[PDB]
Design a protein around this ligand. Sequence first.
Ligand code: LUK
Ligand code: LUK
Lengths: 424, 424
Amino acid sequence: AMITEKSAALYARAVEVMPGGNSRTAVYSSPYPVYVRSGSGARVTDVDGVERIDFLNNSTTLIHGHAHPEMVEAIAAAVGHGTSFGMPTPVEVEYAEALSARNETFEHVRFTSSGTEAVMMAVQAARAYTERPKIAKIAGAYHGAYDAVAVNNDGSGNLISHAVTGNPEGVVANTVVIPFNDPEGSLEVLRRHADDLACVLIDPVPWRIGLLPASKEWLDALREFCDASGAVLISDEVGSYRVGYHGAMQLLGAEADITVMGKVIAAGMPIGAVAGRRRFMSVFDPSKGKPALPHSGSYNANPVSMSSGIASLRLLTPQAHERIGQLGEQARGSMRTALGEAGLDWEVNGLGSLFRVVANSAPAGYDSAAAAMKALYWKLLENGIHIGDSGLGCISTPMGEEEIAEYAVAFAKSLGQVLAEGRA
Amino acid sequence: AMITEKSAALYARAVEVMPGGNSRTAVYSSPYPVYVRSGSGARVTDVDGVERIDFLNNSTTLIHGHAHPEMVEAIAAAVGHGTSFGMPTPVEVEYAEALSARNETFEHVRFTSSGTEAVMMAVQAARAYTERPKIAKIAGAYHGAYDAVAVNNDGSGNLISHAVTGNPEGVVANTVVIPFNDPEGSLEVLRRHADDLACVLIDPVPWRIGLLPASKEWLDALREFCDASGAVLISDEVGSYRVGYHGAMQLLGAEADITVMGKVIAAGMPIGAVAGRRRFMSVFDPSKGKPALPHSGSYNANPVSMSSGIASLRLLTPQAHERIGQLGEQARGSMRTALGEAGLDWEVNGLGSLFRVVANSAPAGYDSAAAAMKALYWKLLENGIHIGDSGLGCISTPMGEEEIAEYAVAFAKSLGQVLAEGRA
Ligand SMILES: Cc1ncc(COP(=O)(O)O)c(/C=N\OC[C@H]2NC(=O)[C@@H](CON)NC2=O)c1O
Ligand SMILES: Cc1ncc(COP(=O)(O)O)c(/C=N\OC[C@H]2NC(=O)[C@@H](CON)NC2=O)c1O
C-alpha cells in the first residue's frame, strides 16, 4: 500500500554526498528512512505527499507541533531583524528571565546551540568548580555525543565501561557508571570515587532504559551524597524537562545544582541551556576578570532561538501542560488495552505527555522484541502515524481527543498486522 | 558623546539571570557590552538607536551581512514548513550536494548545529578510524570549547600543556601541540607520537596567533607526515574557509583528509559540517550495520539551517568572493597607512575579506598592546564602527568601497583619540 519512491530517489542522491546517505544516526532506517517536506499542527507530509499524525515530534522537541502560527510569527520576525550578532540582544535577557522563572534552582542560565553542547558545558562547569576529574552517570542513559558522556549510553544496565570506538582510556576512565533507582548499588560506586567526583550526572526520566522515573529514595540518596561529598548534582532534562511544569526534578520532589535543558524550551529551533544555582554557574562569570570557564559559540543566545524560546514558554501554560498530560494518560491507557487484547506482555511507560512502548517477549516470526517493535513502527507509518522505532512517543499541544482516538485505532490495527505477518 | 543607557539597563537585568550577565564569553566587554536590536545590510542598530557599520559580522559568520533579503526569504519559507523534523528532508540532500561541490575533498558531508560540535565529531571520527588516542593541534589556535581542543587555545606560542581549569589529565595528556609554520619543530613533536596519533588538527589561517596563513613548506611537512603515519589531516576552516572560493587548504595549495566548516557556509543560522574523503567519513555510515561512530543531534540538517546554507552558497558566487577580496585588500592597506601616519608599529594581517589589527608596541598610557587595542575597539564604537576587541574584522557583501573609505576615516580618528587619551 505504502509508496516511498520519492524517499528512495532522495536516498539515492544522499548516499553520494553523505555517509550512508545520513547526517543524524537516530533518523536513519533500513533500507532508507521516509523523507518529509512539511508539517502543520500535529501532522507531517512526506515527500510522496502522504500526511500522517506525528506522535514523536522531532524526538520530543516539538511540544507545540509543526509550524505553530505564534512560533512561525516570532521566528520569522526575528530572522527579518538579523539571525545572529557578535553582540548580546534584548531577547536573550527576556528569554533568560522567562526560563529562570520556571524553577527556583534556575538562578543563572547560559544558552548553547544544542543539548549536546549544554551537557558538555555542565560537566566542564562541575570540573572547573570542584577541580575534580571524575563524573558519574546512569548505566544505559544517553546524553549526546560528548565523549565524557558517550559511555554506557546504549540502554544496557551493565556497569562495565563500554564506549564508542576510538574514545580513549583517558576519557573513559574518568566516567563511572551507577545503576538507575538502586540507592545502595549507586552509593557503593559514588563512595568509592567520592574524593575525585566533580559531578553526578542523571536524567530523572531516561527513555533509553525504559522511561521510568527516578524514585524519591534514589534522588534523596544522590542529593545527600552530593551535599556530603561536594560533587555537583546535574539533572540532564533535555528530554525529561517536559514531564513537569517546573521540570523533572521538581515533579519528583528533588533539587538539582545544575539543570541541562533543550528540545521543548525552544520547541524546534537550535537550543540548549545550563541553568543552576549562582555559585556553580560563577565559573562562567567574565565580569570580575578572566572566567574560570570560557564558554563562547557563534549562535549562543542568537535572537532567532531566543524568540523561539520566548514563544515556546509563553504557549507552554499550566493549562496546556495539564491537557497534554491528560492526552498522554489516555494514549498510554489505550495502548495497554490494545497490547492486552493482542495477547502481548509488552509494557507502556511514561509521565505526562511522554510515552514509550517497551517490547518484552518477541511474538512468533520475530528474532527479538526490538525487531517486533521496528515492525510496529513501520506498520504505524503505513496506518498514518509516526512514532519512534523503539516505542518512544509524545503528545503535542495542537492534538485533541480526535488525534488520540485515531492513534488508538491505528495502534490496534498495526499490532494485528505485525502479529499476522510474523505467523505468515 | 556615546549613549549606552539602554545597554546598561539590559545588563542590570542580565546579571540577575546569567553569570555576570553573560551567555557567550567572546561578546562580553567591561563594564558591559553594547546590546543590539537589529541589522540591515552592513549596518547594526544598538538598543540606544545608534546605527554603526559592522566590520566583524558575528565573528566572521555574516558574509552576506545582516538580514540579506534573499537569505530572509529562504529562511522564513523554511520556517513556515517546519523548523525541525525527526525525519530527513529534501533540503539536507540539496545542501550536501551544494557544499560537496565546493572542494574535491568534500566527498561526504555531515551536518552539526555548531563548529564546536563539528570539530568534536571530526576528532571523534579520526579516533574511530585510526583507533589511536592522541591528537596534535597548533600552539595558541582556538577550535571551540570541546575539552580535547580547549588546550593551548589562548594565542600563546608555548608548547607546554595549558588547559581550562578542571580539564582532566586524562584529556590533556592526549592533546600534543606543534609550533605554527615551523616544519622541523612540528615534525619533532609528530614523530615522537606517530604510533599513537589519530589526527593532526590545523587551522590554515588561525586568527588567535595573528591571522597569518600556513606556509607551503609547513603544510607539505604535515601532509607527508599524515600520509606516512596514517594520522588523519583535519583542516578546521570554521573561520578560515572564506579566504578561498574552495576553502583555505585549496587556496594554499594543500588537501585535508577531513575539513571542519561552519559560520559562512550558512551565514547566520546555527550550523557546522564535517566534510572529507569517503573512507574517513565511513565511521559515520549506519547503512551497513551499526556505525563505528554514532552521531545524532536534534537540529542536525534541520531544514531552516539547510535553507540558510543553500541561500548562502548561492549568494557566495566567484564574483562576490573576488569583490569582498578587493575590499579586504583596500581595508588592510588603509589601516596600514593610518597606523604608519599615527607612528604605531602595529601590523595588519589577513587574506581575502578577513583582517586582523595586531597591536605590537603599547603607546604612552597603556599597560599592554592588548589594552591599547581594546581602547581602539571602544573609540571605533564611538566613531560608528564595530570590530573585534583584539583587532579581528571582515568584509560583508553589502559593503562597497564607500563603507571601507568611511572605516578608514573612523580608524584614523579613533587612533588619534586613543593616543591623546593615553598621554592625558
Ligand atoms: C538526555 C539528553 N541529553 C542530551 C541530548 C542531546 O541534545 P541535542 O544535542 O539538542 O539533540 C539528548 C537528546 N536526544 O537524546 C535522545 C535522542 N538521541 C539519540 O541519539 C537517540 C538515542 O541514542 N542513540 N534517540 C533519541 O531520541 C538527550 O535526550
Ligand atoms: C577555528 C574554529 N573552530 C571552531 C569554532 C567554533 O565554532 P562555533 O561553535 O560555530 O562558534 C570557531 C569559532 N570561533 O572561534 C573564534 C571566536 N570564538 C571565541 O571563543 C573567541 C575566543 O576565541 N578565539 N573569539 C572568536 O572570535 C573557530 O574559529
